[PDB]
Structures are given as C-alpha cells and as structure tokens.
Design a protein around this nucleic acid. Structure first.
Length: 182
RNA sequence: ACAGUUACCGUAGCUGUAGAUGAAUGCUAAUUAUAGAGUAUAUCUCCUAUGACACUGCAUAACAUA
C-alpha cells in the first residue's frame, strides 16, 4: 500500500498473484462490486464500488536507473516477437508502423519476449504516440487489459543529510515541459 | 448670452439668437486618380434554393535506401 504526504494510508492498493493465468481473471469480475466498508456494531457500513484495472507496473534492475534520467520524455514498449537487434532490426520494421522515436534501448534478461524503449523530442509527439498505439491495439484484437505499452517514470527518492526532500520541494519548475493546447 | 412686448414701477408668460447633427425634403455642382467612425440599420404577403457534394488529415501502415 502506498502513502500520502502525511504518512496516511493512500487509497491506492496493489495486489499480486502467484500464477499468471489468474491475472486476467481478476480484472474481469471485480467491476462494480460492493462487499462492505466497515464492520461496526455487527452491521455493515456505507457502500463502495470496486474497480480493478491494470494501470501501473514495477521494475527493478541495475541497468535502468541511469538510462532513465537523461531524456525528459521516455517511452516503454513490450510484448514483442522473437529476439531482435536495435539498429538493424528494430529500426527497419519501425518504418511500417508509426512509432516516431528519436532513440531506442534494449532490455536483457534472457526471456522469450523483448522490450525496446523509445524516445521523443516534444511532449506533443509523445502524447500523439499514445493515441496511435491505443487505436492499433483495438484493431489487432490484442486486449484492453493486456499490457502492451506504458510510460516510464522515476520514483521519488529521499537521501540523507538533506534539509528538504525532492518531493517536498515547492520551488521546482519541472512543469514547463508540458505545454497546454486547447 | 443679449434684445423686443403703451412713451411709469414688482410678478408671470412669449419671439429671434448658442451648442449637440445619432431623419426627410428643395436649388445648384460629377470639378486630379492619396474619401472616414456606429446596432451595418424597421413591420407584413406569394414563390424558388438549402439537407449530404461543408474546412483539414492516407502520419486514415505513405511515393517504402546499391
């Protein structure tokens, strides 16, 4: 379970499963469910509608912390076919689709699935890419709930011998990179 | 801002004259080719057209490396 700024239990709860088969089965029936809220006076409390959906992932590796700090708009893609090169294989087939990525990276591990990274110049290009992928997913009949793509992010860290944490910084100006257009 | 209303004196009430030109009309002028601001101005009757051909995008997997 996560936590808010005031060390309060955040409503964001995360679960896991031993196997992979049951993963899909969890995010198909937990929609609009009202088990209970609180057990006081031997009776149930207020209602609450359940909503389960895959919208977040976690990764821990020794070759991911450094690469994910240089670019400002970094993408993540996975669920690819048999083992592939970057310059010779990933670039060439990219032309067919509409990725429009400045650079790319790899993700070893020795599994039967690859995951190549993407880079963008402006926030608008990144945003537009998201839509493209989403649309394509439907066409292919892959699955709504099936992880296909995501947005990479750097988790907040708190070091020592510091008067103020980075997350609690009020003078930060890391919002100008996201222009607003309407 | 000033004169007039029996050829005596207080009130009261009238004509001409100022500016603002956000209507209409009469006479006379189309006279080099550097001519302007605002609801772009109101009521009622008959008939015709609109309504599937409206802007943009194939980056809507295109024109695709000796």
């Amino acid at each position: 379970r996560f936590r808010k700024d005031g060390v309060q239990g955040d409503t964001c709860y995360v679960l896991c499963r031993s196997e992979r088969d049951a993963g899909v089965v969890l995010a198909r029936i937990q929609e609009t469910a009202v088990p209970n809220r609180v057990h006081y006076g031997q009776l149930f409390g207020c209602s609450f509608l359940w909503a389960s959906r895959s919208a977040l992932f976690l990764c821990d590796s020794q070759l991911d912390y450094l690469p994910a700090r240089s670019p400002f708009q970094v993408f993540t893609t996975g669920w690819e076919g048999d083992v592939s090169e970057e310059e010779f294989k990933n670039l060439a087939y990219q032309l067919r689709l509409f990725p429009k990525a400045v650079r790319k990276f790899s993700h070893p591990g020795g599994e039967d699935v690859s995951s190549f990274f993407l880079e963008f110049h402006r926030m608008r290009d990144a945003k537009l890419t998201m839509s493209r992928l989403q649309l394509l997913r439907r066409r292919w009949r892959i699955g709504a709930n099936t992880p296909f793509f995501g947005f990479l992010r750097m988790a907040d860290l708190r070091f020592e011998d510091d008067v103020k944490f980075a997350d609690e910084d009020s003078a930060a100006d890391s919002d100008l990179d996201e222009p607003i257009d309407y």
